[PDB]
Amino acid sequence: MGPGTWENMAFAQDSSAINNIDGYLSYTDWYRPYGTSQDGKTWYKTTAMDWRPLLMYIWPSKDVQAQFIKYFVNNGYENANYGLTKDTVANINKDTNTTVLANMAQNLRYVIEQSIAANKGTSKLANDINSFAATVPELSASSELSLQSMPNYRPDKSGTIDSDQVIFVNNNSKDPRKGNTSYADSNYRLMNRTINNQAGNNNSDNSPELLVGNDIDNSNPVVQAENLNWEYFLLNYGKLMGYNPDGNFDGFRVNAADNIDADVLDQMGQLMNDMYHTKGNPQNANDHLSYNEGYHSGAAQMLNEKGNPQLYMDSGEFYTLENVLGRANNRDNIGNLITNSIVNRQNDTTENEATPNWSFVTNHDQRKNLINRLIIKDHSNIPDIMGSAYKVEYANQAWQEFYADQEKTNKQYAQYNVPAQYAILLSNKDTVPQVYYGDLYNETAQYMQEKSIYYDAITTLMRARKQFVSGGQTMTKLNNNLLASVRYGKGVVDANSNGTDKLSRTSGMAVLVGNDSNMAQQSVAINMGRAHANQQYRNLIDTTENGLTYDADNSENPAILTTDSNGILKVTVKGYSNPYVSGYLGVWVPVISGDQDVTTNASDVVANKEKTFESNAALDSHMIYEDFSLFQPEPTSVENHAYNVIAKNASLFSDLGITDFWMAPAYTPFGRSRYNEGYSMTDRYNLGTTANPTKYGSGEELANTIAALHKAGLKVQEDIVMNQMIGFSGQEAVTVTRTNNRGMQIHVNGQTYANQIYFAYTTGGGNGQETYGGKYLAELQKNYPDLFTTKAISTGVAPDPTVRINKWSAKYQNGTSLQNIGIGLAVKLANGDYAYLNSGDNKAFNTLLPTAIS
């Protein structure tokens, strides 16, 4: 034919002229037409480089077409000679006559082609299309139906929106109005097999499958085998990488243990036991300490019934500390410190009975909640402030406000009684306490450059723990608002015991904590125990009008007090209000010369063939340290890499009694993630390189750091992250439904969507996944065949090592949190049929394209 408008057709019906996502078309994609024109008269053939946005030629509706014309004419594509002025476009809409809309749009292309020629390229055009798309709900985030759009929405301080989710469902339809995404089908996706609902018959926890990101299908047997591969890798990291051969993790902090199929917890425990013979051998289990993150108390029962392959996280203790000591006002009673925990500590004088647990005063999430609460307070007219309207500037402002508030007596945001919270945590029996990096150091400065105001107090408590803390515990109210927590010492079971150990006499501790700042002055009597009669005690910490003292400087008590013939210590006490104490804090330890370590070796405790972790004096001797913050800044040099700073300070951590070092998730971070912290990762096996370090450093430094920590006598755990990945660069056509965090369909302001093709980012994993994914499975099966014959609870089938995951995609994913791309990107014809390009391996339908590009 002669030249004309038919040259709007695609240059060819394949991926060389039409961009596509598994054969589907996107309105925001581009194609190569056969030719183009600036006037309707002369037509030039496209070269292979002359591509054009589909939105110049097709639209999801009349309405959107009218908006496209309106928008472009009002943003630099006005031309009176082609019937396109601000007026004339002024009142066109979906009810404008169809042939005048087509004609306006054809003339607009001529005007756009003049702009392209005038600007020698498509760059301005490309930005004008993106700006336009953002104004159209179905081509942008708002059609995804965020809960943030509800009227009078109150942002959540967590900084994630739980019920902003989509599930990936099966779709092998031949109906072109439904489409087909069968390559993302799964016979698994068993969702919410969490905690006690592992078998699908006990949802008393109601713990959600979905949190944030691309949620991984930990019910898929192939994925379960890949987690074993990943654990094995991390447990042998250094020698598998040819880096420091002693640079191998000893255990795991299990991220989101409440939000993944519980099979993987069983499986991790099984692996650890096969490799290291942990079950029934306290020495081995405790050398490979592992502990599960979670905020659901039902996990205690779950872990006990399983013989405790990991520690339970005692979140109730954390909330009790904050509600009793940490609020400004409406503090719960002091006695709640005794009872409101997974362990009652009123008179705890037995071993191997309590739920093996870890406890904390702060972690990175709790600091985050506080900073976000501040951000939300400071910027209250933005309902999507925790979503896409979040700005790092608001966090910086919040941190400036936080550090200032932390130093005050009358704190508006930061916690009260941080030292007293630690004094309780670090003396408690039947727990592995966890100290937070950000309570020892100003967490937004370069790594370990600035000590926190609480550094002196917490470190004093930490060193004293190693020296003195052991034996039975008794907590008792001295008055309605004041309590004494007493440890009786190594081999001293209870208040009536004489002591069975050479260190019995010179160990034990009394911690006095009150939470009423107006408490009247009074004398109090503390029962140190019958092993501690006529004994000198040092005033380790006492309260003053302005703060704390470590040498009894201007406190109510002297540097030494002495118990009577019954072992009673008499002490003066009162209410104070200063930056360190709102109420009272006092700590007493026996006088010694000089050095003492009450650590109970695991060889000397009762072993139980049915248990892995047991709560006894040997487990109690451990202390965990969380080495990171979410607000930890990017390093400014190799010397400031957290891994190098840590390696340099290895002996310090040992001196403080830390036995188990919790390292940040070390994985390659998604660059555009909010915090660059490692939970939002693109590669599970790349822990950074010299040229491209993570926030924390390179893999080579990590291995050296782990070896340095090992040389100082510590064990090291990795934050392992089975729940999600975030930052895939590969889009996939996936069939989805709008759900809450348990994958149940919901409405949002009366609207919803189900079984829709959505172009989710799902595919990736980096060269790490390509190289290391499933690499160790043949050897795991050779040495430990039981891993791949033990039938999982949730599925009824063993993990499957015959498939290697070299690349992640939707078929291994339960779904994703809303990706902020839009639910209407997928091109549909007038009749509702999905457009489809049959070409290559995309054979679901015959080629069906919009008539505009025929």
Ligand X SMILES: OC[C@H]1O[C@H](O[C@H]2[C@H](O)[C@@H](O)[C@@H](O[C@H]3[C@H](O)[C@@H](O)[C@@H](O[C@H]4[C@H](O)[C@@H](O)[C@@H](O[C@H]5[C@H](O)[C@@H](O)[C@@H](O)O[C@@H]5CO)O[C@@H]4CO)O[C@@H]3CO)O[C@@H]2CO)[C@H](O)[C@@H](O)[C@@H]1O
Ligand Y SMILES: OC[C@H]1O[C@H](O[C@H]2[C@H](O)[C@@H](O)[C@@H](O)O[C@@H]2CO)[C@H](O)[C@@H](O)[C@@H]1O
CB 249 to ligand Y: min, Å: 21
For CA atoms 143, 144, 148, 152, give the dihedral sign: positive
**Element holding 287 (H helix, E strand):** helix 282-287
Strand pairing class (576-577; 730-739)? unpaired
Residue with smaller CB distance to ligand X, 254 or 302: 254
Q: Which residue is nearest to ligand Y (CB)?
A: 122
Closest to 460 in 3D by CA, of 383, 534, 541, 575: 541
3-state secondary structure 143-175: HHCCHHHCCCCCCCCCCCCCCCEEEECCCCCCC
CB 669 to ligand X: min, Å: 8
d(CA 272, CA 284): 10
**Element holding 366 (H helix, E strand):** helix 364-378
Size of the site for Ca ion (CB under 5 A): 4
The count of C-alpha atoms lying within 13 angstroms of the C-alpha of 60, restricted to the half-sphere facing its C-beta, is: 18
| Binding at 104: pick from Ca ion, ligand Y, ligand X, none (beta carbon under 5-8 Å per type) | none
The 669-698 contact track toward Ca ion, x by CB under 5 A, reads ------------------------------
CB 387 to ligand X: min, Å: 7
d(CA 282, CA 804): 34
Collapsing DSSP states into helix, strand and coil, what is residue 584?
strand
Tokens 């150990």 correspond to: 501
Binding site for ligand X (CB under 6 A): 159-160, 211-214, 255-256, 293, 365, 368, 672-675, 677, 679-680, 721, 723-724, 726-728, 761, 816-820
CB 366 to ligand X: min, Å: 10
- Contact yes or no for 220/263 (Cβ under 8 A): no
Contacts of 221 (CB under 8 A, 6+ apart): 188, 792, 795, 797, 798, 799, 800
d(CA 200, CA 794): 7
Residue with smaller CB distance to ligand X, 39 or 365: 365
CB 214 to ligand X: min, Å: 4
- Contact yes or no for 696/688 (Cβ under 8 A): yes
- Contact yes or no for 9/1 (Cβ under 8 A): no
For CA atoms 377, 381, 385, 386, give the dihedral sign: positive
What token pair was written down for 182?
Answer: 């069968």
Residue 259 annotated as part of some ligand binding site: yes
Residue with smaller CB distance to ligand Y, 1 or 49: 49
Closest to 619 in 3D by CA, of 249, 321, 308, 324: 308
| Binding at 637: pick from Ca ion, ligand Y, ligand X, none (beta carbon under 5-8 Å per type) | ligand Y
CB 665 to ligand X: min, Å: 8
- Contact yes or no for 113/52 (Cβ under 8 A): no
What token pair was written down for 442?
Answer: 């100003």
Per CB under 5 A, which region of 175-183, 207-215, 243-251, 699-707 contacts Ca ion? 207-215
| Binding at 215: pick from ligand X, Ca ion, ligand Y, none (beta carbon under 5-8 Å per type) | Ca ion
The residue type found at 760 is A
| Binding at 728: pick from ligand Y, Ca ion, ligand X, none (beta carbon under 5-8 Å per type) | ligand X
Residue 384 annotated as part of some ligand binding site: no
Among 22, 29, 138, 215, binds Ca ion (CB under 5 A): 215
- Contact yes or no for 167/208 (Cβ under 8 A): no
Residue with smaller CB distance to ligand X, 197 or 214: 214
Residue with smaller CB distance to ligand Y, 100 or 638: 638
Residue with smaller CB distance to ligand X, 73 or 223: 223
Among 128, 144, 209, 443, binds Ca ion (CB under 5 A): 209
Residue 378 annotated as part of some ligand binding site: no
Residue 723 annotated as part of some ligand binding site: yes
d(CA 82, CA 796): 68
Residue with smaller CB distance to ligand Y, 51 or 753: 51
| Binding at 201: pick from Ca ion, ligand X, ligand Y, none (beta carbon under 5-8 Å per type) | none
CB 608 to ligand Y: min, Å: 45
Backbone dihedral angles phi then psi of residue 285, each to the nearest 5 degrees: -60, -45
CB 319 to ligand Y: min, Å: 34
The residue type found at 465 is R
Residue with smaller CB distance to Ca ion, 70 or 742: 742
| Binding at 695: pick from ligand X, Ca ion, ligand Y, none (beta carbon under 5-8 Å per type) | ligand Y
Binding site for ligand Y (CB under 6 A): 19, 30, 49, 51, 122, 126, 634-635, 637-638, 641, 693-695
What token pair was written down for 516?
Answer: 């009423």
CB 816 to ligand X: min, Å: 5
d(CA 408, CA 513): 20
Residue with smaller CB distance to ligand X, 158 or 599: 158
DSSP 413: S
| Binding at 30: pick from Ca ion, ligand X, ligand Y, none (beta carbon under 5-8 Å per type) | ligand Y
| Binding at 634: pick from Ca ion, ligand X, ligand Y, none (beta carbon under 5-8 Å per type) | ligand Y
Q: Which residues are annotated as part of the binding site for Ca(2+)?
A: 209, 215, 259, 723
Q: Which residues are annotated as part of the binding site?
A: 209, 215, 259, 723
Contact residues toward Ca ion (CB under 5 A) are 209, 215, 259, 723
